[PDB]
């Protein structure tokens, strides 16, 4: 089912984390689609940390599941954290 990628990013005041997300929309079966990293900004905090990749599926932010959640909930959780944020993701070959 892939391999687990885990990193804790440290936000610098004034800055984004450095990646974008897509997904989290309700499907015909009532579940939300997965939330995935769609880009990582060059030279950003996420890029310098280096662990995450575009295409990774987000599984957790800190203690909160990112499975079966709306897009806006994932965005809110990311934007809520002003210093350290733990990202748990999964990546398939």
């Amino acid at each position: 089912a892939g391999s687990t990628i885990i990193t804790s990013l440290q936000r610098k005041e004034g800055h984004s984390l450095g990646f974008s997300i897509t997904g989290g929309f309700k499907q015909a079966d009532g579940q939300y689609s997965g939330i995935y990293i769609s880009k990582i900004a060059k030279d950003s905090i996420a890029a310098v940390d280096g662990k995450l990749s575009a295409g990774d599926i987000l599984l957790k932010i800190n203690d909160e599941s990112m499975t079966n959640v709306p897009h806006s909930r994932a965005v809110q959780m990311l934007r809520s954290e002003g210093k350290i944020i733990t990202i748990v993701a999964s990546r398939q070959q």
Partner: peptide, 5 residues
Amino acid sequence: PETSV
């Protein structure tokens, strides 16, 4: 929708 964070 793709969102930068």
